[PDB]
Paper text:
The bifunctional enzyme Δ1-pyrroline-5-carboxylate synthase (P5CS) is vital to the synthesis of proline and ornithine, playing an essential role in human health and agriculture. The P5CS molecule contains two domains, GK and GPR, catalyzing the first and second steps in the biosynthesis of proline from glutamate. The GK domain catalyzes glutamate phosphorylation, and the GPR domain catalyzes the NADPH-dependent reduction of γ-glutamyl phosphate (G5P) to glutamate-γ-semialdehyde (GSA). Our results describe the assembly mechanism of P5CS filaments, in which the GK domain forms tetramer and the GPR domain forms dimer structure, and both domains form specific interaction interfaces.
Numbering used by the authors:
A (entry chain A): 45 to 128, 141 to 212, 229 to 276, 296 to 338
B (entry chain E): 115 to 127
Write the structure that this text describes.
């Protein structure tokens, strides 16, 4: 909890963006949200060509894989039949997503590095320390290691891309940790009920537990709205967006 | 019209 106010976010040195799955894929499930994806890549490249050391934790590989595999299944039927999986989709989606990120980042000079982790990799101490060394070595060379879960051969208290992001932010000792989710923030009761209020400053449920854990270890977690324009640039810019987590 | 109706959608493209 080094930071304590939304003006001390200008001096965040190492932040860990975390893209949800509602951010990348659209509601139609007919492609990507290329607008939001390219805008987030633009903001990350602009806040990384500035001096900070950012390292995204992407997500939403299975959705891309589902789209690609549905197309391949349609395009491989007999015209007699036309007139009347987690892992395969994860593999296809991971390949395609890294290709897209690579193109969008190389348009800015930056370089990315796909680092896929699993769940047991956080249990074995040797592997965990080796992974920390790898991540620090990648960050110090001005690379943007785009972490993700090895969902193609072993699908997954790490149980998501959220708790994994909190663990990474705790281990790599990051200042900020942006949990770009689908909701606009945190309320004391869901919007379709009484008491609709935003909790801009959090005093002292999965996202909430992950944020609490990462707050009790040095990081300062922020939960933003993914479908909001200019999320990261204003979260860092100091404006009151999302719900900031301090004591 | 007896064969081409029983090809995969990929071959006929």
């Amino acid at each position: 909890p080094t930071f304590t106010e939304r003006s001390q976010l200008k001096y965040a040195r190492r932040l860990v963006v975390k893209l949800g799955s509602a951010v990348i894929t659209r509601e139609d499930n007919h492609g990507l949200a290329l607008g939001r994806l390219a805008s987030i890549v633009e903001q990350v490249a602009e806040c990384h060509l500035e001096g900070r050391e950012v390292m995204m934790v992407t997500s939403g590989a299975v959705a891309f894989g589902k789209q690609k595999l549905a197309q391949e299944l349609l395009m491989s039927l007999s015209m007699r039949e036309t007139l009347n999986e987690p892992r395969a989709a994860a593999a296809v989606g991971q390949s395609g997503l890294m290709s897209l990120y690579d193109a969008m980042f190389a348009q800015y000079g930056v370089k990315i590095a796909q680092v896929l982790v699993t769940k047991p990799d956080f249990y074995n101490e040797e592997t965990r320390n080796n992974l920390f060394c790898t991540l620090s070595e990648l960050i110090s060379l001005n690379i943007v290691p785009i972490i993700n879960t090895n969902d193609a051969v072993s699908p997954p208290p790490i149980k998501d891309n959220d708790s994994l992001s909190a663990m990474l932010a705790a281990e790599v000792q990051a200042d900020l940790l942006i949990l770009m989710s689908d909701v606009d923030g945190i309320y004391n009761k869901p919007p379709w009920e009484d008491g609709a209020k935003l909790m801009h400053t959090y005093t002292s449920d999965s996202k909430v537990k992950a944020a609490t854990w990462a707050l009790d270890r040095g990081v300062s977690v922020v939960i933003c709205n993914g479908m909001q324009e200019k999320a990261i640039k204003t979260i860092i810019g100091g404006r009151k967006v999302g719900t900031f987590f301090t004591e």
